């Protein structure tokens, strides 16, 4: 609902007062205390969550008006405010309660209260100072309780909820840095000077772009109908009354170039933008490249005179979008829309932006409105997608002087016509952001300081552009080549275009319709490319011509193909070089920027002639963090969604932890994970909403959902690279272990985090070899490490690597390691490694296959000794002496772990505890005696066998229980149910609960011999006697 | 398509048998070097993905897509590369209750057939367990013809009629293989070891029969059983019967078959079994003559037997 | 032949070329070869062990021939066999499979009638005499060079090298040296395991030491004092440690960049290893022990008899 | 049968013809009363699976045994 708004000075959480009506039709008379939902409009496309506030009646307030405390938003009412707000009734007056609220508090009062001997004193001081009352006062997250004294750090679990000391900790936290003194909730109290100057001269101020489209409603003066929409401007400072002209007046100077008429408004209270600057729309700002600060002054013209110019010959800017055949229709229609609807001010020698949607182009609406009842078919279906500029190109002839400035194109008294195409530069990114303003698909805003390759490319483009101004010219040509798909090379190029304003000619060799083999089609491929370039390029300003997936066309020479195909392919191979030459010659600034997905395929005739090659890597730690911070930003999640409730995230999530988890993921993977998280959040919300009511403000991403999403995306990618489906196992599923955990952490974990230390690599620890006795959790340890450390997992399953030929097993080994190396963060697990790498020069030759195996493995494992880190090889064996000596030396299998039988009571009990995870021990039997029952001779697998025997005994018991229970209903004397699906009849699933008892464990200990012979343990002790290195 | 669905508001495009148009012409182990198989059709698919992703980024409710192909993997891998689709809903072969549930409907679909006296399809589903909802319609028409040609009964089916019609017909799946096996069903043989045969029956069936409870199992199910015996005292026949109980499929290896002299095949033939077993369903994977594979705890000779084990 | 090229281009006799590196595993062979590339500036074609062999009969032949033809297309180039035992073993008195093909191919490509030039074949392996004697004939692989792990009292020189290694010029060091640098004590204590053993010691000690700066005995860098307890006396609930950890993580909402510090002696953000503590790593690292290899090296160099 | 090892752009005609033929099958069966579509094939396997399933109760026609031969000799040698 909509109502009037007013502000007043009051405590932090004083109840809001509402008019008599609002109270009558929204205040439930049975409610002991009334609550509601309040919403504030903002300068932006989205809407913030609404504050849930206590309400009180106030008959003095006029029809449908509300008064709220300014401190609820950190405002002061001593400056221009809004005239309205939004209200929503509370859903059944139900309000949640919080658990772990936190308040920051300055050092002085914190220490002073600390010396006090009593605790309820602070609770009473809450009411004394802040008027807070328990079980009634609703608190909001991040609110400043008092400037320079204290502030709310969080609310939990809900961002809003009731205060109840029996439930809320209200954690007071010392503000040691005392930054709350600087963090005033308000912007300021007074301007620099009230009198300033009686008649101020023209002033130079920064003209910067408004980061969002304005809503016609929130304009303090009421604009006249159908006029002046395109020349709105906004400001907040005292300048509006520094010049005698009031709000809604005009100003023209604009750097004392060709003065551009524009109307200025006042910026309202919540606006967080910078003061003493003029915020302008794209049209006004497009005429002023560079010249960040511009001169401005009042212009009391009285009225926009000379509103009639006979005709006007507008023109079309050169650009990729403009010149397309298909789009030729929609543009003229939207222009005829542009005319005869309002009085638009056209200062000659200026740009005119027009937005449209590409996807609508090939479709059209009828002329129904042109025939009769002329109205726009509501743009609520036309989501603007693409931008194109137009240029006035007309100082029309008329019986007046300087008529080219500040005239109007009357709907009936004037007609506009198109002349020709012209040339200019668009705005650079740092000057303005058209996509943000129009809400297009925002191309990623790289930060040059953390992405080397975009800087390397933009340097080349900027130097080329600057040369263009010089008399000399040089043929700049770049070629982006990357190891794997989806690494943002086209986003790279588009960002490079924006950051410099270089026109982008985007042609994708995929889309071009000529047949792949280009049979008798040279004139088709090349005619298409030639036409689409030369139509736009000559009038194009310095332009990058971007060849996406150029590899499709430029096929390599084929050694196993018919001669005619080879010749016709060589034809295009040569002619592409010739075309590059001729275009580089024809105009200055022409920059050929091709992209490929595998450099090796590009022919020599093009590989050599090309100048610059840029390797675009899979993003590193420092980068994916930024990518996350981008894709979770407010202006990018709300974009896709017209649903009322906005989306956002709990701030407690640590981007760094995500980045750690997201190792090896491409940016598209990151967008996928983000959108899956948004799935989970939305589904959760809609499922839960059917309850009475709570969490209405917004639908929120949460860390657990993100982690689940990561787990999903990881395995889905791993499936894409053909990895096994490693089952979920974690540290809780292993026991009897203390030191080897530390070892594995020191090997894997330590370099993973804190990268600043291992700056040079230093050939980090490389090989983990689990030797020692059999059946002791080695394969478990491996699947645990795989599941826990967020690494892709590849496994060589024993002597699988062998084959029936010479050499092909070495192909196998090279192919496994190659596949590992193409998913760099990875683990290679060798199980029964004694099979694949037996001791050389022993057990006969047998054709030497095993020798050639171990030789290839030895040479690949870490022979090349350069950057081979990032892939860790983990192996396990019954016996190490089978392994060849050359694998034992550090750098290949460096860390040898004696993981083996516990032999100690406490370790046994630890194993019991670990295997008890998810198990149903729910009884007075204790693991102490259970351990005492089974001597140390029993193994690590032994207690799993015992647990499984107990489980199976429980199953047997419950089975006979269920049988004799259903024997009371299935028999003919009962004749109740014979479906053999009795769990529907036994709907009390809890009745099925298996629980172990000393019967189970006792019988198991009776019926479970140690699975390792005294002979076997002796033998493996002897094997240990081959104590490596002695 | 994109224009119309974009204009018509929240909408689906659904493509049946999508492999006929966006399917990859698979490489047939040919050359990968020529940009793999970046043919006309992968090109078309890429175009479509681009053009629909364009709209989808504007408002996610305005379009969705519904592909359908024989199997998930064999649809063009570009779908799973560009992350255009992530769902794993698979139409499994209907079993037990399903069979009955729709048999009746077929019996009353267009013709009006009457079931045999004193039955409710209870065991009609027990037989023809592998039939697909294609096979069932054909089977119904089969029964219709068989009873109609008799000229003396045209209202109610009979048990002997069903027995007759059951032969001379096979499920679509495995129709052309023309394989006959496991005719040795002899469950009726109690044998002497029935005293403890129940343990085997338990460990194979009960975890499946008592399905709901075992969903709560936090520990890997006991699954392997070994059987000594004085030579040939009924062993393969017992295995055959325990197979023919049919709760699980059966395939078996006989130890001396696979012990090739060739180094590679000797081990590769074991993997040959698992690669197939894991690809279908739960299976017995019976080893006969397992003594001949076992390595007699040999460690010194390091013969091929060690490799196999 | 390239640094002083005007002099070495004087003789007609084919420049003495080819080297066979042999001796103990983990003694710098693949290093010493792979380091030549930038030191000299030649090209360095790599043959990572038995890549040549192929299942098809005679495909290995078309592989070796193409290898050498490639090497002859771009010249000069070092040609390094990262091991040379599994390719081209000693020819038996019988077929002995496809290896007798590859051997007789390599000989042909090495000193054939149409003899190549400007190519330097560099071979390494642990057990070299299993290379055919016709590949040891001087004129090919002609100089045999031993490497030795014992080097008693010379292990200091290597240690000092590895610790003072500066490969990444961005920093004037990678390993965190200390001031005294009494490397002699540990060098003697090493007992002569191998050459890679010392790098292993270095990394092991750096691992044992890095916990000082990061873990800090959970008292010297984390919970260092005044900021340990800034929340008040919690009494509403028993959550004591996890509660304070959560509050600390939440309060660390500040943002900083380029937070460099050089509290170390001469290094950035590191805890220099005390060589006295570095002494604790000698009892963990292990050698590779074999007298068979020592005896076996009697043979490759003219059996030390001929 | 689908000899998928054959070159592309041929198998596409194969798919086209197979499916379109089956389309005519269904079209005849449902659009007209009394269509029966007897087929004959020289070897059954070569009929693609996509089409084999549709038909019902295929007949194997064994070669005549001596009892049949007795009647066919009497047919050809008839008056
Ligand atoms: N670093 C990035 N930050 C944000 N979005 C990115 C990034 N890299 C790629 N994307 C997004 O991924 C999608 C596809 O990227 P793009 O078209 O640039 O890929 P490409 O490099 O040409 O890939 P390919 O060669 O596989 O076709 C776009 O939606 C783009 O915004
Ligand atoms: N100490 C233990 N802690 C936890 N689980 C254990 C332990 N010992 C055995 N288990 C469980 O029993 C299983 C049997 O161990 P597993 O077969 O993985 O051992 P292994 O040493 O790799 O043996 P092998 O090399 O002989 O195949 C483990 O996968 C795990 O589920
Ligand atoms: N000057 C040096 N002397 C010895 N080792 C060094 C030296 N500098 C670095 N190292 C390191 O010591 C190890 C020496 O390995 P080495 O070059 O002997 O291996 P390799 O020739 O491939 O051995 P293998 O005989 O086992 O196949 C490597 O980890 C290397 O990084
Ligand atoms: N209880 C039994 N009932 C029926 N047949 C049996 C029984 N016991 C043994 N046989 C016969 O002995 C053989 C059992 O198979 P198996 O023990 O594998 O024989 P073998 O080991 O010689 O191959 C079959 O021929 C089977 O008919
Ligand atoms: Mg691309
Ligand atoms: Mg194991
Ligand atoms: Mg080596």
Residue numbers in the entry:
A (entry chain D): 1 to 1030
B (entry chain E): 510 to 818
C (entry chain C): 716 to 1021
D (entry chain F): 556 to 634
Quote the original article.
The double-ring AAA+ ATPase Pex1/Pex6 is required for peroxisomal receptor recycling and is essential for peroxisome formation. Pex1 and Pex6 are both composed of two N-terminal domains (N1 and N2) followed by two AAA cassettes, known as the D1 and D2 domains. We used a Pex6 Walker B mutant (E832Q) and “trapped” the heterohexamer processing an endogenous substrate along the central channel formed by the active D2 ring.
The resulting central pore of the D1 ring has a diameter of approximately 15 Å. The substrate is threaded into a right-handed spiral staircase formed by pore loops 1 of Pex1(D2) and Pex6(D2). The pore loops 1 of chain A (Pex1) and E (Pex1) occupy the highest and the lowest position of the spiral (grey highlight in 3d). D2 of chain F (Pex6) does not directly contact the substrate and does not follow the spiral arrangement (“seam” subunit). We therefore define this conformation of the heterohexamer as the “single-seam” state. The aromatic residue (Pex1 F771; Pex6 Y805) and the isoleucine of the involved pore loops 1 bind to the substrate every two amino acids in a “forceps”-like manner. We therefore measured the buried surface area between adjacent protomers and distances between Walker A and arginine-fingers of the associated protomers. In line with these observations, our analysis suggests that both the “bottom” Pex1(D) and the disengaged “seam” Pex1(F) D2 domains are indeed in an ADP-bound state. In Pex1/Pex6 “single-seam” state, however, the D2 domains are organized as tight dimers and this signal is not passed on to the directly neighboring subunit, but two subunits further.
